[PDB]
Structures are given as C-alpha cells and as structure tokens.
C-alpha cells in the first residue's frame with residue numbers, strides 16, 4: 002500500500018490487473034484483536050418445563066437393523082432408489 | 098517453605114528428595130534440580146479464615162465461572178473451620 | 193445475545209469467476225511489428 | 236494458505252490439527268470478528284486464483 | 288447444508304492431468320462461491336447438540 | 340442430429356442407437372430364455388428388458404429416448420445392455436436360483452456379540 | 453423429538469427393504485440375511501462361496517449398477533468360529549445408492565478375489581492379507597502392502613497386541629537398524645471404561 | 661516527483677534512529693531500519709514499537 | 710449445476726489462426742507469465758522479521774502446558790485425573806495422595822511433551838481450569854528428556870506465564 | 886470336518902510344495918549373501934533357512950502348511966527382488982539380542998519370568 006504511483010502503475014500494467022483494489026497484504030480493514038465479550042445463545046433444550054429427556058433422546062430411539070430376509074406373483078422389479086436425475090448445465094457459467 | 102537435604106538437594110513440595118546413596122542424583126550433576134518454590138500448602142495457610150453469618154456458605158473459588166464448581170460448606174462445627182475441598186479457603190460461622 | 197453474525201444487509205458480492213482479461217495486440221499486428229523491425233534492421 | 240491457517244488458529248487454537256468439528260456439532264463457537272476476516276480473505280482470493 | 292448452497296460442479300472432458308487441474312481450479316472458484324453463501328446465511332444459535 | 344461426443348472418456352458415440360439397442364435387447368431375451376421359468380432373475384430381467392425394448396420401439400428420437408429410458412446417455416444405456424447380457428450369460432453358469440448352499444453358523448451374524 | 457434427534461427417512465428405508473427382497477430372491481443360493489439399519493443402510497449377508505456371483509450381479513444388473521467398489525474391509529470377531537467378517541461397500545451412481553455385502557471366513561479358508569469384478573479390490577483385500585491374514589485365492593499379486601518387510605503376524609487381529617512384539621533401533625556395533633523385543637519405558641495404560649448399567653434396551657440380548 | 665519523497669523517508673529513517681550510529685546498530689541487530697512509535701519498554705530493555 | 714472446463718473448440722477463421730500462430734512463434738503467453746512474475750517483483754513482500762516480529766495468534770492458541778493456581782497461591786489441581794483419562798495420547802501421568810492438611814493434591818503430574826498431540830482436550834476436561842495449554846510455542850530443547858515435564862516444570866510454567874494465561878482465559882472463557 | 890483347501894488336497898501335495906520352496910530358498914541363499922553384501926557365510930544362511938523350515942516341522946494340517954508355503958514364497962519374493970534391505974535379511978540373525986537364560990537357575994537369577 003506504501004508503493005509509489007510509478008511502481009503502482011508499473012505493477013498494475015505488468016500483472017494486467019488492478020492490484021491495489023485487492024491487496025493480499027492486510028491493513029486496518031481486518032477485525033480488532035480485542036473484542037467485546039459475547040453472549041452466546043442456548044439450545045432448544047434449555048427449557049425449565051416440557052423438557053423431559055425421554056422425549057428428546059436420540060440414542061435410545063436407535064433400533065436394531067430390521068431383518069428383511071433371513072435363513073432363520075408378477076411383482077415389479079425394483080431399484081434401490083429411483084434413477085438419478087440428469088444434472089442441469091449451469092445457467093451461471095456453462096463454458097459453452 | 099522449601100528446605101534442603103543433607104546432600105544439598107532441595108526437597109519438593111511433595112517431599113521427594115533422592116537419597117545419599119542413590120545414583121540418580123547424577124542427572125543433576127553439572128545441572129540443576131528444578132523445584133517450585135511456591136508451596137501451595139504454605140500459601141493457602143496464609144489466608145484469613147473468613148467469618149460469615151450463615152449456617153451454610155457457598156464457595157466457587159472466586160471469579161464466577163473461572164473458579165471451581167460451586168460447593169456448599171456446613172459450618173456447624175465450632176471446633177473446626179469449614180474448608181473448601183476444591184480451593185482450600187476456609188470459613189467460620191461468626192456466632 | 194452477542195454472536196458472530198453477518199451484517200444486516202449481508203456481506204458484499206464476492207467475485208469468483210475467471211478474469212484473464214485479454215491484453216496485447218492482434219496476431220496481424222504482432223507480425224507487422226516484427227516485419228517492420230526486420231525491415232528497419234535490414235535497411 | 237497462511238491466512239487460512241490463521242482462520243483455523245482463531246477458531247480452534249491450532250493451525251492444522253484443530254480437533255474442531257466434533258460429533259454433535261463443533262467444539263466452540265466462532266470468535267467475534269472471524270467472519271469479517273473470512274470475508275476480507277474471500278473477497279480478494281479470486282485475484283490470487285486468476286494469477287495462478 | 289450442502290443442499291442449501293448453490294454451486295457448480297466442474298466436469299472434465301478428456302480425463303487427463305490438464306482437465307483435472309482445471310477441475311481443481313474451478314472447484315476453488317466454486318468454494319469461494321459457497322463461502323460467500325455461508326457467510327451470508329450463517330444462522331444464530333448453539334454450536335453443539337443440546338443432548339448433553 | 341449426431342451428438343458430437345458422449346461427454347464420457349473412452350465411451351464412443353453410437354451412430355445407430357436404436358438398432359443396436361434392439362439387437363442387444365432381443366439377445367438378452369434370447370440368452371434369458373435359457374434360464375428356468377421359476378427363477379426370479381429370469382422374470383425380473385425379462386420384465387425390465389421388455390419394458391426397455393417397448394420404449395425403444397415406441398420412440399424414433401434419440402433425445403426423448405434418453406429422457407424416458409432414464410439411464411443417462413444412450414451409449415451408456417448400450418453399455419448397460421451389454422453388461423446385462425454378459426451377466427445373464429454368467430448366471431446360466433452360476434445357477435443362483437438353486438437353494439442356499441449352506442446355512443451360516445448359529446451366531447454368525449449376531450451383532451453385538 | 454424434533455431439534456436434537458436425527459430425522460428418520462422412511463422412504464429410503466422402504467425402498468432399501470424392497471430392493472433387499474429383490475436381491476435375496478434373485479440370488480437365494482448365497483444370500484443368508486438381508487437387513488436395513490435405522491439410518492437406512494442395506495446389508496446383504498451372503499455365503500463366501502458366492503462373493504463373485506453376487507458382486508458381478510450388483511455391478512452388472514440393470515436395477516443395481518453398483519459400479520464403484522467404495523471400500524473393502526475385514527472385521528475380526530474372535531467369539532465367532534469364522535472370526536473374520538469381510539465387508540464390501542458398493543456405490544451405484546445410477547440409482548444414487550450404496551449397499552453393503554458382508555461375508556465371512558476363518559484363518560484358513562480362502563476367499564475368492566474380486567479383482568475380476570472390481571479392480572479396485574486389488575489393494576484392499578491385499579491389505580486384508582497384510583492386516584488380518586485372510587488369504588485371497590486367485591489374487592494377481594498377493595503380498596504385504598502396509599507392514600514392514602520382515603513383519604510376522606497380522607496386526608489388525610484383536611489377539612495381536614497394540615504395540616508389536618518387536619521394536620527397531622539403530623545399533624552402532626552392527627551399523628544397522630535392528631529388531632529387538634519391545635520394551636516400553638511406560639506401559640500403555642489399559643482403561644476399563646464400560647459402565648455396568650445398560651445403555652440401550654433396544655439392543656438387549658436374551659439371557660442364558 | 662515521488663522518488664524524492666522516498667529518498668527523504670530513507671534519510672529521515674537514518675535521522676530517526678538517532679543518527680548513523682543508531683541506524684547501523686538497528687541495521688545489524690535487526691536487519692530492519694524502519695521507525696515506529698515507541699509503545700513501551702519492559703524491565704529488561706526490550707523496546708516495543 | 711455442472712460446467713465443462715475445457716470444452717472449447719478454437720475458432721478457425723484466419724484471424725484466430727494467425728493469433729494462435731503469433732502466440733506460437735512470438736511467445737505471447739510466455740511474456741504474459743514473465744509480466745506476472747515482474748508484477749510480483751515490485752510488491753512489498755509478506756516476510757515478517759522474526760524474531761523481532763511475531764506471527765499473529767489468538768487467545769485460543771494451544772502451546773506449552775502449565776498448571777494454574779488460585780488468586781491465593783493454592784494450586785487449582787485437585788488430582789481428579791480427568792485430563793489423563795481424556796488424553797488421546799496418554800501423555801499425562803498422575804499420582805496423588807492426601808497431603809498434610811488433608812487436601813486432595815497430586816504427588817506426580819507428568820506430561821510427556823513428545824507424546825502430547827497439543828489438542829487441548831485436557832484443558833477443556835479440567836473442571837477447575839488447572840491444566841491449561843498456554844501461549845508459549847518457543848520451547849525447543851537440545852535434549853529429549855527436557856520435554857518430559859514433571860509437576861515442578863508445569864507449576865513453574867504456570868508461575869512464569871500466569872500473567873498471560875489469565876488474560877487469554879479472560880478473553881476466551883465466555884466461548885467455553 | 887470337511888473344509889475347503891487352499892492349494893493342497895492332502896499332506897503329500899503340501900510336502901511337495903514345502904520341498905520346492907526349500908529348493909528355491911537353497912538356490913537363492915548365495916545370491917542373497919552376495920548382493921546384500923552380508924557378512925555371514927553361505928553355509929550360515931543355509932543353516933538359517935534349514936532352521937526356519939524345521940521350526941514348522943510339527944504341523945499336520947494341509948491348510949496351515951499351504952499358508953506357510955505362501956508366506957515363505959512371499960519372503961522369498963521380497964528377498965529376490967531388492968525389497969528387503971540388508972536389515973530385513975539380518976533380522977533372522979538375532980545378533981544384538983543377548984542370549985537369554987535357558988536353564989532354570991539363571992532365569993531364577995535374572996528375574997521373575999519362566
């Protein structure tokens with residue numbers, strides 16, 4: 002940022018870009034190293050009522066794997082899922 | 098209160114010192130034995146016993162969430178002060 | 193609450209596309225400059 | 236890449252091995268002012284890709 | 288939340304070292320796009336699951 | 340209209356996709372007729388192959404055939420038909436409609452142990 | 453159960469159950485179990501004589517098209533008489549799906565190599581030779597891939613100790629890196645962490 | 661011309677370290693001669709700019 | 710939602726063919742590359758003057774371990790061994806006894822700084838903020854065993870760096 | 886009690902394979918001493934190959950000796966190709982290891998182990 006306008010114009014010309022607009026070195030535009038203290042919010046389970054853990058217990062609603070076939074008609078042939086949708090070419094920048 | 102063995106070796110706050118006939122003093126030969134001279138058993142005994150006017154006091158070590166978990170100390174013994182098991186600060190019911 | 197949040201109108205638009213900005217003379221012009229340099233040198 | 240390691244160090248305290256993304260969320264919230272610096276990095280990073 | 292961010296996927300054409308190079312360059316471009324969207328759409332709230 | 344490339348490396352463009360698909364589907368049905376009637380591989384593969392062959396006979400276009408066969412490019416649909424043919428020729432040899440060769444041990448799939 | 457619990461996917465659960473029935477009745481010669489977990493992942497437990505007929509099916513069948521071998525894995529379980537559990541993770545790009553094909557062997561029974569199905573397996577099961585000792589028949593170049601060249605034993609078995617049996621150091625008498633029996637300056641401290649209260653009643657086993 | 665300002669900033673970097681002795685002192689100890697605002701000095705003699 | 714890198718057919722009119730042949734014979738893109746490198750020649754470099762200048766750090770930084778005391782001189786550690794239970798490398802070795810006033814304190818507190826992975830799980834497992842991983846990263850030794858810290862070295866790191874560790878914990882305890 | 890073989894149908898084909906592996910190792914030992922510039926004699930290396938074969942001489946299972954032939958062929962391929970260095974070849978000769986006490990009285994002297 003401290004460069005003279007002769008070196009600045011030379012540097013912009015040699016790169017072919019406006020380099021002073023986007024300087025990779027950092028100056029006073031970055032955040033302060035000292036910040037005010039935060040007040041972080043609490044989650045949804047910080048409630049004094051209607052907050053029994055048996056109604057929000059993720060690990061205890063895990064089930065054993067449902068056994069479909071075990072060795073102890075004209076029904077449709079299935080796939081594991083419907084076939085994947087063909088992607089759309091990008092409207093932003095297709096390179097075509 | 099650091100002290101010194103007859104071998105010249107400093108005794109730590111734990112009480113560790115090598116014996117005279119112990120070969121492992123040779124690691125301090127030409128070098129030093131790093132002990133810490135601030136004994137916590139001495140520094141906590143310098144604190145004044147805090148006189149309070151309740152039957153049960155609380156202690157978190159000061160600083161709020163920067164100290165220890167908050168404990169409640171019963172002060173019904175007038176023989177003994179009520180000592181925090183975390184910080185070692187001790188309390189006495191004033192009556 | 194005080195939390196690391198973006199500004200109210202959001203951040204500014206960030207460039208992310210290729211910018212190779214096409215400088216220089218044409219091929220006709222560069223061959224003409226090279227031929228003119230040769231002709232000056234030969235003369 | 237050094238500035239992005241500063242982003243890792245500000246978010247976790249380690250420049251490379253953060254141990255930050257944990258099962259259940261992340262270990263710690265963003266420090267205040269971090270997203271502004273991520274913005275100031277990202278706004279200028281396109282010119283760095285362009286000159287590469 | 289990748290289903291909520293908008294980005295493109297660079298596709299090669301010849302499978303060589305040069306197309307994979309260009310795919311990585313354009314993935315850096317699209318990563319800058321995703322980072323812009325993530326900085327614009329960061330919600331408030333907690334950072335761990337509140338299952339303690 | 341002759342699509343210029345498939346977009347996939349090493350997958351060439353098929354000039355006549357419909358005739359190639361009809362040949363491959365009738366060849367899959369021919370190989371698949373050598374399998375017993377009770378076999379679920381025969382019934383399921385005859386079902387999907389007759390559906391694909393009906394769709395190929397129903398559509399003159401290549402693009403609309405790609406959008407309603409729902410398998411990507413038409414050339415990788417041809418590739419999938421060839422893989423199905425090679426699979427069915429192997430399934431003749433393997434005979435997997437036969438009963439289970441061996442029951443597993445008593446707690447072979449018990450997890451957690 | 454909204455914010456903190458993972459949302460259950462019933463549609464993919466139903467579709468994977470139907471496709472597991474499909475795979476089981478197309479291939480009943482080898483398929484021993486079919487199961488779908490609660491987080492919607494399909495496992496096809498097969499007999500080890502049908503590694504190749506199953507995996508060539510799922511790679512080539514027009515309703516499966518599992519064209520990518522993502523990962524091949526062994527798991528040592530010493531309480532089984534077939535202590536090794538060989539696990540094939542497959543990715544179908546066409547139907548945007550993943551499947552798991554599990555089979556078994558012990559120390560001595562070979563498994564047929566799936567390099568004629570997926571060339572990707574060429575190192576994985578080679579790793580399974582190096583780490584578990586599961587021999588693979590008809591592998592093109594079966595040898596060690598991760599351990600040291602003179603290494604005895606197979607490390608990822610659970611009767612193999614955490615530290616090895618030998619450690620290395622440079623010996624200056626012989627001018628050479630040498631192997632000695634391992635002696636730790638500090639032993640690894642085994643922690644007994646398991647609580648004696650049952651955590652998950654859904655997974656309770658019936659008693660004796 | 662803006663080269664004259666560059667040479668004058670160099671000469672006042674020389675004059676800002678307390679002459680040629682301080683300039684060469686900080687040049688050989690620090691391998692940098694730019695001047696700053698003295699933020700402080702500790703009990704050891706470390707000077708912070 | 711996808712794009713094709715390198716799916717351009719170059720134009721075949723005489724203008725573009727002569728442009729490409731002038732690029733071939735007259736080396737236009739090579740002069741472009743030389744110009745970009747010359748553009749970086751006239752930039753101020755990114756080099757900081759270490760050790761007189763220092764790399765920027767945050768108060769979350771995980772450096773050298775230290776044991777903290779209370780604002781009475783009593784050490785915070787009450788020998789609960791949560792730091793050595795959580796320690797991913799088993800770098801912490803703790804032995805304890807009741808000392809002469811009956812306080813629950815350690816007799817051994819070793820951190821092997823050559824096993825330690827500097828991940829800070831010990832400081833966040835600590836219920837009393839006793840073990841902390843401080844700001845110091847400049848503690849390279851000439852001997853392996855000088856990195857085998859015992860309780861005395863850790864309490865001395867606490868006494869050495871407490872004026873800074875207290876301010877980093879002051880700036881970062883509300884995120885924890 | 887009916888298992889799948891590895892290579893051998895019985896013990897006799899297995900002993901054929903063990904015999905051919907010993908032949909291949911016996912042929913390879915002088916090349917191994919020469920190109921790894923080992924400071925053992927060729928007789929010492931052939932004695933070590935004899936020792937490594939005769940350690941396993943008590944095995945009566947065809948599958949286990951099939952796997953021992955397989956692992957011996959892998960060691961041989963890592964020795965013929967220069968994949969092992971000199972150190973991996975010399976790890977069969979426990980040179981830096983002091984000779985352990987073998988009788989009862991000296992094991993009683995040195996420690997607690999049997």
Ligand code: SF4
Nearest residue numbers: 796825826828829831
């Ligand atoms: S930082 Fe991590 S590895 Fe190091 S002592 Fe703490 S818990 Fe152990």
Ligand code: SF4
Nearest residue numbers: 786787789790792835
């Ligand atoms: S440092 Fe903290 S976690 Fe570790 S034993 Fe002491 S009080 Fe417990």
Ligand SMILES: [Zn+2]
Nearest residue numbers: 156158181184
């Ligand atoms: Zn207290």
